[PDB]
């Protein structure tokens, strides 16, 4: 058949702290029609805010990837983005008792599992994807994103911290999605922070939740995290899984691959706008047939 578009098959509820308010927030994942795409509810407020996750939304940019609209604001919906795209979900509603997404263990992986746990349905309508057809680059200072035409969908990274945990690391990671599992290589890689700045942070109003039970927390010399970590390339894996929700923004899943040198929400937001603007970069397209493809989808 047709590669369908991909919605909730149940009702998702969770509950958690939001990474940098540290507030208590409930979120609900629900089913959504055809062509909705993903969008954020504050349901706190009444009438609710609603904010599609789209990059024409993306206000601030700074430690996390925030939506805004009038004057309210949904925070780091960066890791649940990725989360749906790496699974291929479409259309869906997120409400939020609160102005950020729970932080949940710092991965995309328990979104994962109460997603699959619920199950996706398909919908009556094929799935559109965004296929790159040149080369779109962005650069601010030593920092730079880059889409290139790719037939299935490829994401590279590459960080260069001056750090003695990082230094003589595995800093560079490729994943082709079409031999690499998103559940099992990408979605576990946890965030990170520096015990360094967490006075710094707090005094901003940043990292209120963050702790070990969310956070890889890098001391001057060691990781504090007393139970290690999950990939020995966790790190670059992440900003991997940044890369992936960030580029969601755009609405569609995408054929094309992505590679970033030093990147984050900022400059990954500026590739999507300088993207979207060059119509010539990119088209819609459908797959009447799921066999010939270059990217697939698990059942859902
Ligand atoms: C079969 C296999 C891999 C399956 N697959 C397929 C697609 C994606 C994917 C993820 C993100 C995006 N995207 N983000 C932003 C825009 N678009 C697009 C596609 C992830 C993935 O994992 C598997 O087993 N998965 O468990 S495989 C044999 O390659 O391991
Ligand atoms: C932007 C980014 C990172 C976001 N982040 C994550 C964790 C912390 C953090 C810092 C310190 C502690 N802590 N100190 C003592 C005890 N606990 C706990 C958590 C700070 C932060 O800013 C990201 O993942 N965005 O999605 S990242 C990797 O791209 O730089
Ligand atoms: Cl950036
Ligand atoms: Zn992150
Ligand atoms: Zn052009």
Not at 127 to 148: L, N, T, W
Not at 227 to 232: C, K, P, S, T, V
Request: proline residues 3%; negative net charge.
């Amino acid at each position: 058949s047709m590669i369908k578009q991909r919605t909730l098959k149940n009702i998702i509820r969770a509950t958690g702290v939001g990474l940098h308010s540290g507030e208590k927030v409930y979120l609900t994942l629900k089913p959504a029609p055809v062509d909705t795409g993903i969008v954020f509810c504050r349901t706190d407020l009444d009438p609710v805010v609603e904010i599609p996750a789209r990059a024409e939304n993306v206000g601030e940019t700074t430690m996390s990837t925030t939506l805004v609209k009038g004057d309210v604001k949904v925070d780091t919906v960066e890791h649940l983005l990725s989360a749906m795209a790496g699974l291929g979900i479409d259309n869906a509603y997120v409400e939020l008792s609160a102005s950020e997404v729970p932080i949940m263990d710092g991965s995309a992986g328990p979104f994962v599992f109460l997603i699959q746990s619920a199950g996706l349905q398909e919908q009556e309508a094929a799935k559109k994807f965004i296929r790159i057809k040149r080369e779109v680059s962005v650069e601010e200072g030593d920092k730079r994103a880059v889409f290139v035409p790719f037939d299935g969908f490829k994401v590279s990274f590459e960080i260069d911290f001056d750090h003695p945990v990082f230094r003589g690391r595995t800093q560079q990671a490729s994943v082709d999605f079409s031999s690499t599992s998103f559940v099992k290589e990408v979605s576990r890689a946890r965030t990170f922070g520096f015990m360094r700045d967490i006075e710094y942070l707090r005094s901003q109003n940043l990292a209120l939740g963050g702790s070990v039970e969310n956070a890889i927390v890098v001391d001057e010399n060691r990781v504090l995290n007393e139970d290690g970590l999950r990939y020995e390339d966790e790190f670059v894996k992440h900003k991997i899984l940044d890369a992936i929700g960030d580029l969601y923004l755009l609405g569609n899943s995408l054929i094309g691959e992505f590679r970033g040198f030093k990147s984050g929400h900022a400059l990954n937001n500026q590739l999507l706008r300088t993207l979207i603007a060059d119509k010539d970069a990119w088209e819609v397209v459908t797959f009447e047939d799921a066999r010939t493809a270059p990217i697939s989808y698990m059942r859902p």
